[PDB]
Amino acid sequence: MVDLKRLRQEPEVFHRAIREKGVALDLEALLALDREVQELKKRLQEVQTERNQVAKRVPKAPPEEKEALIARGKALGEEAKRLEEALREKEARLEALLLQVPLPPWPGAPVGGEEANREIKRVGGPPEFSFPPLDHVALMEKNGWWEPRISQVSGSRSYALKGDLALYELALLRFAMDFMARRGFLPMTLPSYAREKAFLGTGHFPAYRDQVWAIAETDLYLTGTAEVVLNALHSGEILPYEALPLRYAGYAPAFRSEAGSFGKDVRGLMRVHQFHKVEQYVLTEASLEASDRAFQELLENAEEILRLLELPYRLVEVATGDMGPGKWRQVDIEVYLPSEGRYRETHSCSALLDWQARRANLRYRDPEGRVRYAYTLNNTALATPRILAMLLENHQLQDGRVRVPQALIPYMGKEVLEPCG
Amino acid sequence: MVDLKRLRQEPEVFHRAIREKGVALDLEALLALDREVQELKKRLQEVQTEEEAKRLEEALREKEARLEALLLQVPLPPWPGAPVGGEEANREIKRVGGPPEFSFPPLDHVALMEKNGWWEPRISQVSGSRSYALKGDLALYELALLRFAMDFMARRGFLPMTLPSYAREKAFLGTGHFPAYRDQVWAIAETDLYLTGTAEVVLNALHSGEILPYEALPLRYAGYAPAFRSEAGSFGKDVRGLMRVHQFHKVEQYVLTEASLEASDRAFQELLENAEEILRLLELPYRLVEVATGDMGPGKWRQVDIEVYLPSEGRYRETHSCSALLDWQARRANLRYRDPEGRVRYAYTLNNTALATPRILAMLLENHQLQDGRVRVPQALIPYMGKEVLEPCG
RNA sequence: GGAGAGGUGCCCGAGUGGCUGAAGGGACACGAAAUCGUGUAGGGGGGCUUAAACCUCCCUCGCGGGUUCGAAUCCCGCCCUCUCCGC
Ligand SMILES: Nc1ncnc2c1ncn2[C@@H]1O[C@H](COS(=O)(=O)NC(=O)[C@@H](N)CO)[C@@H](O)[C@H]1O
Ligand SMILES: Nc1ncnc2c1ncn2[C@@H]1O[C@H](COS(=O)(=O)NC(=O)[C@@H](N)CO)[C@@H](O)[C@H]1O
Ligand SMILES: [Mn+2]
Numbered sequence: 069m070v071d072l073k074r075l076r077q078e079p080e081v082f083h084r085a086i087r088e089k090g091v092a093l094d095l096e097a098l099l100a101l102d103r104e105v106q107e108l109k110k111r112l113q114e115v116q117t118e119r120n121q122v123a124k125r126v127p128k129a130p131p132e133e134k135e136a137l138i139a140r141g142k143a144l145g146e147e148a149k150r151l152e153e154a155l156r157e158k159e160a161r162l163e164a165l166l167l168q169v170p171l172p173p174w175p176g177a178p179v180g181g182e183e184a185n186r187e188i189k190r191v192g193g194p195p196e197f198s199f200p201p202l203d204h205v206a207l208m209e210k211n212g213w214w215e216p217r218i219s220q221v222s223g224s225r226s227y228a229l230k231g232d233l234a235l236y237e238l239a240l241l242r243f244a245m246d247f248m249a250r251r252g253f254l255p256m257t258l259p260s261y262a263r264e265k266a267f268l269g270t271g272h273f274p275a276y277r278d279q280v281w282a283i284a285e286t287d288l289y290l291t292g293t294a295e296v297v298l299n300a301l302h303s304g305e306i307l308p309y310e311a312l313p314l315r316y317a318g319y320a321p322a323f324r325s326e327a328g329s330f331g332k333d334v335r336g337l338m339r340v341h342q343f344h345k346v347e348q349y350v351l352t353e354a355s356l357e358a359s360d361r362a363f364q365e366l367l368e369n370a371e372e373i374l375r376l377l378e379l380p381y382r383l384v385e386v387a388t389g390d391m392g393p394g395k396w397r398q399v400d401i402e403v404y405l406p407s408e409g410r411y412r413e414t415h416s417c418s419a420l421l422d423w424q425a426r427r428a429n430l431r432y433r434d435p436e437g438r439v440r441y442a443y444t445l446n447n448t449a450l451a452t453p454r455i456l457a458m459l460l461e462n463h464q465l466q467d468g469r470v471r472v473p474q475a476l477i478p479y480m481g482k483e484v485l486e487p488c489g
Numbered sequence: 490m491v492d493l494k495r496l497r498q499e500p501e502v503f504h505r506a507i508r509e510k511g512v513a514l515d516l517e518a519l520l521a522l523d524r525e526v527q528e529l530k531k532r533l534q535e536v537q538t539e540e541e542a543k544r545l546e547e548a549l550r551e552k553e554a555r556l557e558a559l560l561l562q563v564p565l566p567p568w569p570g571a572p573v574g575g576e577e578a579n580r581e582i583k584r585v586g587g588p589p590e591f592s593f594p595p596l597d598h599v600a601l602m603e604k605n606g607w608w609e610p611r612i613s614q615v616s617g618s619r620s621y622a623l624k625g626d627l628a629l630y631e632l633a634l635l636r637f638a639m640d641f642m643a644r645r646g647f648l649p650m651t652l653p654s655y656a657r658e659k660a661f662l663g664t665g666h667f668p669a670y671r672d673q674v675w676a677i678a679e680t681d682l683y684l685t686g687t688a689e690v691v692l693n694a695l696h697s698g699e700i701l702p703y704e705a706l707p708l709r710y711a712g713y714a715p716a717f718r719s720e721a722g723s724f725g726k727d728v729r730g731l732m733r734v735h736q737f738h739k740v741e742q743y744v745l746t747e748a749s750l751e752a753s754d755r756a757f758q759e760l761l762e763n764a765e766e767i768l769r770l771l772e773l774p775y776r777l778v779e780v781a782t783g784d785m786g787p788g789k790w791r792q793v794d795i796e797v798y799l800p801s802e803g804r805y806r807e808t809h810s811c812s813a814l815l816d817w818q819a820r821r822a823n824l825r826y827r828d829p830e831g832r833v834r835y836a837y838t839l840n841n842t843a844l845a846t847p848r849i850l851a852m853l854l855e856n857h858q859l860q861d862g863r864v865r866v867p868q869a870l871i872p873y874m875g876k877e878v879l880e881p882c883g
Numbered sequence: 884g885g886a887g888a889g890g891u892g893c894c895c896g897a898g899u900g901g902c903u904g905a906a907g908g909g910a911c912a913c914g915a916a917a918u919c920g921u922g923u924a925g926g927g928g929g930g931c932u933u934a935a936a937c938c939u940c941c942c943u944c945g946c947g948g949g950u951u952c953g954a955a956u957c958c959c960g961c962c963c964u965c966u967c968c969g970c
Contacts, residue, residue: 106928113928113941120941123953127901134952141952149949156948215650221694222656223682228691234651235643238636238713245632254882256609257628259736260715262616263962284678287961288617297622300615306925319632321654321715342653431925439925488648613963614945672884673970723885725966 069426070169072102085172088179088388098165105158112151119144167274170393171423177388177397184387185400191371192380194404195462202468203407204460205336208233210468212489224334225326225341227453231488232480236459236472237344237452239479241319244346244450247373248317251365253348258297258320261288266300269428271394271420278327281341290323294347295446299428302351306439307432313352313362317449320345337453338412346449351442353432354422359443363397363419366447370401370415373450376475379458380404382411394423401448403458414455415448490820491563497523506566509573509782514562522559526552561668564787565817571782571791578781579794584805585765586774588798593860597801598851599730602627604862606883619721621734621847625882626874630853630866631738631846633873635713638740638767638844642711645763647742652691652714655682660694663822665788665814675719675735684717688741689840693822696745700833701826707746707756711843714739726802731847739845745824746837748816753837757791757813760841764795764809767844770869773852774798776805788817795842797852808849811841 075082076099083095122141129137178184208214213233218226229237249255267273267289272280281290291297298318307314322345333339348369350362367383374381386398396419402411422441424430430442463471470485477483496503500520507514529549536542572578589595602608607627612620623631643649661667661683666674675684685691692712701708716739722728742760746752761777768775780792790813796805816835818824824836857865864879871877 109941110928116941119953123901123951126952129952138952145951145953152948215695217695218653218691220697221660221691222653223680226653226655228653228695229651230648234649234713235636235639237651238632238639242629242632242636245629249629254624255628257623257631259612259616259620259622259734261736266615281680282678283684284676286675290677297612297615301609301611303614319628342655610964618963670970720884720970722970723968724964725968727967729965 069166069423070171071422071426072166075099075169076102081172082169085170085388088173089170089391089393090181090389091168091170091393093165093168093170095169098162098169101158101162101165105155105162108151108155108158112148112155115144115148115151119148164274167268167427168393171396171421173388173391173395174397174419176385177391178385179389180387181389182387185390186385186387187382188385188399189383191375191382194380194406197464199466201406201461202464203336204405204457207460207464207468207470211470211485211487213487223341225339227337227340229453229456232482232485233456236476236480236485237456239476240450240452240455240459241344241346243376243476243479244373245317245319247376248346248348248369248449251315251369253315253317256294256298256316256318258294258318260291260321260323262291262296262300263287264289265303266291266296266428269303269430270296270299270424271392271427272296275393279325281323281325291320292322292324293345293446294318294320294322295349298347298349298446299424299430299444302430303428305431307351307442309353309432309435312432312442313350313358316347316349316351318347318349320347322451337457340453343451343453345451348445348447348449350445351425351430352445353434354440354443359396359419359421359445362445363399363417366417366445367399367401370417370447370449374401374403374414376473377455377459378473378475379455379462381414384411386416392418394418394420396421396423403455404462405458406461407457412454412458414451414458417447418445420444420446490560490817491565492816492820493523493560496520496563502566503563506564506782509567510564510785510787511575511783512562512564512787514559514564516563519556519559519563522552522556526556558668561662561821562787565790565815567782567785567789568791571779571785573783574781575783576781579784580779580781582777582779582793584774584776585769586798588774589800589856591800591858591860595800595855596858596862597730598799598854601854601858601862601864602730605864605879605881607879607881617735618723619728619733619735621731623847623850626876626879627850627854630870630874630879631850633870634844634846634849635738635740637770637870637873639711639713641767641770642740642742642763642843647709647711647763650688650692650710650712652688652712654685654715654717656685656690656694657681658683659697660685660690660822663697663824664690664693664818665786665821666690669787673718673720675717685714686716686718687739687840688712688714688716689743692741692743692840693818693824693838696824697822699825701745701824701836703747703827703829706826706836707744707752710741710743710745712741712743714741716845731851732806734847737845737847740843742841742843744839745819746839747826747828748834748837753790753813753815753839756837756839757793757811760811760839761793761795763843764811764841768795768797768808770867771849771853772867772869773849773856775808778805778807786812788814790815790817797849798856799852800855806848806852808845808852809842811839813837813839 086093178186213230215228218228245255298316322343348366352358352362381403384400391398399417400413401415403414405412421443424444425441431439432442433439460470472480532545572580607624609622612622639649692710716737721735722733744756746756775797778794785792793811794807795809797808799806815837818838819835825833826836828834854864866874
């Protein structure tokens, strides 16, 4: 959600954002409807002022006028009722249009679609094996960690791990939580479902609604990320300035429909319906300086996690057309997956300024007493099992076993993962 | 699913089981409908030796479809040692550990959560009633308990597994969750998928259609998966806080064994001792409860619940539920094995909770609370938490 | 799936139709141990103004709608909380 007052006064700023982000939105029709709504409000307020007048002047009034004054206030009520209905319809349509308005991206973001995504940093590189390397699926098959029977049970885009790799998945999640905890972030375990209000607050609705699984015969939807829950926690609250910034490390199972992924990542751990993810969520004051600081921290935290996992990664600056309607800036972190001979996303670091805060009604009281919309940020801490794909391939041994990075030995109690069958 | 031939030979035994388990099922209408399917098969065999033949096959389909939906409701006879009656007839087998002694008025787990800021009650507005969200050390504690249960089970000879929380209809039918407990399961809209209330649904479905080798038996699985349940109660101390919620985490013990009462009794005992030893290591007072036939479920041969003591309520609360189902699930899920004589037989299935959060946290908080309001960590969990006492956040 | 009790400002809480955007107590801040005094919601129009400040009007007493001359108060739907039952 953008500032409506700012939208009226700098509309070309938002029209340029619409184009660069590929949003299908008629900004002029939006501005036309807004002017209708504002006019109709003025009318309603005119009737409501008379309503309140007449109501105040009925009690102490001469009986000879009493009848006429009550009948007059009754007609005022019937007209306000007619205006409220007209205003209710128009504001509904204006809401649907306003939920599509994108936030203008930061100038440094490449303008274009996915093609314009541009690498900015690279740490470590493709490993050089003195043996023919195996893909992660094959490694799991060799070590007996893969349960292919799960597709018969649960359908495509499902997975089930066996043996040490199952314990490895749960260790990776705790490894990420412990890391985030000792970086100042408050750990939280959260549910994986919420009502529509929460998806509207983050921006997942309406733009990404087909990516969400709904729970039938309920008003609930399965969340694809703990961001949905963490962002909705403080809706309608006016937080104190001294509480800021809020740094949350929320773990929750994730569910994703993966609509429109027909033909992409059909086999493996890369693109499944249900996974595990530890989320970084930051709520800070309405300051570019503070947002830039939190953004850098979220990136560094994710990078450090990958450094401890001993994985070669790269940062990618995401282009306007691949960035999302609400994003000021987005930087993806990609880890190299040899079997695909290319880097694959593992994290997505996003600054959204007040765009989510204006949807979820996230506000704080600054030191001077002014209530202002906060700025929100989020980034992956660690998500399984996609990360396991890189871990298996980058840490495979000659004999087909998989090493465990130094930082994970205390969690697993072994230096090399033991096979099952 | 019960054996058809067994049902024809001894119908009185399955009348007794319907009465003692209280199943809304007319067995005489099922038997009559079974005879009616047999008569239609006697007409077709006379046409096979010698349009009218296709009309008898279009009636057969309908009759068989009705018979199948009605066979899925036939209960398994319980073991004689099970009390007859409802929940009131549940009999305490034993109890281990005494109620805790406090030199101060104990707090309930919600109050302990409020005091230390381990609670996020704002989740009710985000996700609706009957939800929870943990903060600080209690959040870390929940994840520690799950890894602890998986490490324990893995050292006890069970194969650890991380599993999805959704499956197709066949898997719920295969365990018995469908059609009896359909209204306890959330469906995923615009899919043919349903959210599982227990990893039992996935573990039982894995080997559907396979003939397992005798040597591979017994199968011992410790599957972890988030759990989803449509009914988490309404309000009150029975559901308040961490006690009953729509989504939770559970580590599931699941055993598939050969078709012998000896093998099943051995497995049943193992599932108990595992949960008991988990509760022992968690330093929690618990008790075992034999479940009566009417509170047992249609497919259960024997069910023992394990309950843990909750001081604020001065009562025991169910934390584990240990079941033996003989081949009642195997006949639904098509779980078969080859015995040493080379004969294909339906296997026996068992399951029991290993550990489920966050309900177990309610007992942990109240039983291990200190005077100042902190909560100590049992020795078995210090390596997982890195501290002896849970520190507060807010 | 039911029964009863509720939801008011920073919190507890008074309000059986207008004297209530709101008493009293606590908390906090400021000013003049205890005491006294003052202060203590958000949103949106309009006037004036560069702006701010100031003046004025409208909406919100969990959310939305309805009744009425008039609603925090009465009705309806939804949401949440507590206690007892159902599963
Ligand atoms: N379908 C999927 N299967 C497996 N992992 C996935 C899937 N979708 C996302 N992930 C993992 O979750 C991470 C976050 O995904 S994201 O949508 O791009 N970003 C977010 O959700 C933000 N909340 C920041 O985490 C991905 O980088 C990837 O590691
Ligand atoms: N709605 C719920 N909220 C919190 N915990 C629950 C909930 N439902 C079940 N549990 C926990 O999960 C355990 C297993 O529940 S059970 O249905 O009785 N048993 C099973 O599901 C069997 N598959 C064995 O686990 C319970 O004993 C309890 O500890
Ligand atoms: Mn209910």
